[PDB]
């Protein structure tokens, strides 16, 4: 197997957040 | 373009409050002489304590 890899940049939405929340957002965007 | 996002408010936005004592202190300068009570000469600001 070969296997390729990019980089990318990731936005988050914006807002008042606690820090657990904002940790979550950050996953999301790797997921999306 | 033309909106910002913010955070809410509940106050709904507090401004300043004005003090005036006529009768005690001199007019600061620029400000007229008068008896309307909407125009008197001002000597003191702070916020409207409400947060």
Request: net charge negative.
């Given at each position: 197997d070969i296997l390729k890899y990019e980089?990318?940049?990731?936005?988050?939405?914006?807002g008042n957040f606690s820090a657990t929340m904002t940790i979550d957002l950050m996953n999301?965007?790797?997921i999306d | 373009?033309?909106?910002l996002l913010t955070t809410s408010d509940v106050t709904c936005g507090v401004e300043q409050?004005?003090?005036s004592l006529p009768d005690m202190m001199?007019?600061?300068?620029?400000?007229r002489s008068t008896r309307q009570v909407s125009n008197y000469?001002?000597?003191?600001?702070?916020?409207m304590p409400v947060f």
């Open positions: 980089w990318f940049e990731f936005i988050l939405p914006e999301n965007a790797i | 373009s033309w909106t409050v004005y003090w001199q007019d600061p300068v620029t400000f000469p001002v000597v003191g600001a702070e916020l």
